[PDB]
């Protein structure tokens, strides 16, 4: 739970992180959550210039004021919450995606600022958090492992993902009683995902995820009629938590075929 306010403070840290995001200029960037400036800063000297300014989305209006003190016209804030922007509002105009995402994301926010940004996938280049460490276990899991979940199967279809580095408490002022680490998301190209209806997987995986302890037979149950998917040889004594993304993919695709029709 967070409790008032946890600043990153190791300069070391800071760098690596820096180091890790490789901020660059002539990229079009958003940082999620700023703070007090502690990568805010780092990364501004390196990607900022007049006419292209570092972007932020924050709501505190103490925050806001002391970092357009700091940073003057270097720094665009979006004044709001993230999980009600529209981050293509600060796309390029294009076709190709655009749009760099970094932040520093609380433990709540998490799962709901994750499925937020996936209708956005499209127009991204890549996503860079600093995130509990229970989290990033939770985005990288393996089935059947103890963190595998709903974000993981969620995630892991839409983008190729890899934990960077550990980042324990003693990085922050004052430090919290949780290690944080750093992750990366790269959306996969359209003709990178698997040919599944991304809605139809949505539906199958909500389901599945119900219950994830409970066997499948139960939390898919709602498509006995429409699958006999034991026939099929897909194994329902397993549970949610045990199934790959690769393994829902198919479910998904059985699924739209049982529909099908012309």
């Known amino acids: 739970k967070r409790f ?31 703070g007090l400036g502690a990568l805010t800063g780092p990364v501004i000297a390196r990607l900022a210039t007049p006419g292209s300014p570092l972007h932020a989305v924050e709501l505190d209006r103490d925050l806001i004021g002391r970092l357009e003190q700091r940073f003057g016209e270097l720094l665009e804030l979006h004044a709001g919450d993230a999980l009600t922007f529209d981050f293509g509002s600060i796309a390029r105009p294009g076709d190709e995606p655009s749009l760099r995402i970094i932040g520093n994301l609380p433990y709540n926010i998490s799962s709901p600022l994750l499925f937020h ?16 460490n229970e989290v990033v276990e939770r985005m990288v899991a393996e089935p059947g492992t103890k963190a595998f979940s709903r974000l993981s199967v969620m ?19 004052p430090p919290p009683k949780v290690d944080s680490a750093i992750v990366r998301m790269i959306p996969h190209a359209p003709h990178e995902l698997p040919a599944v209806d991304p809605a139809v997987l949505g539906e199958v995986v909500t389901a599945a995820f119900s219950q994830r302890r409970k066997m499948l037979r139960n939390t898919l149950g709602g498509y006995r009629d429409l699958v006999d998917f034991d026939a099929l040889g897909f194994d329902l004594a397993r549970r949610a938590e045990d199934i790959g993304v690769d393994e829902y993919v198919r479910v998904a695709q059985a699924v739209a075929s049982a529909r099908a029709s012309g």
Do not use: T
């Not at 946890?6 to 079009?28: M, S, T």
């Open 155 to 173: 995630l892991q279809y839409r983008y190729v993902m890899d934990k960077l580095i550990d980042v324990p408490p003693e990085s922050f002022q």
């Open 117 to 132: 940004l996936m209708s956005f996938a499209p127009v991204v280049i890549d996503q860079h958090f600093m995130l509990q």
């Open 4 to 34: 008032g306010q946890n600043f990153l403070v190791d300069h070391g840290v800071i760098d690596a992180i820096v180091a890790a995001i490789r901020p660059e200029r002539g990229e079009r960037m958003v940082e999620i959550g700023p």
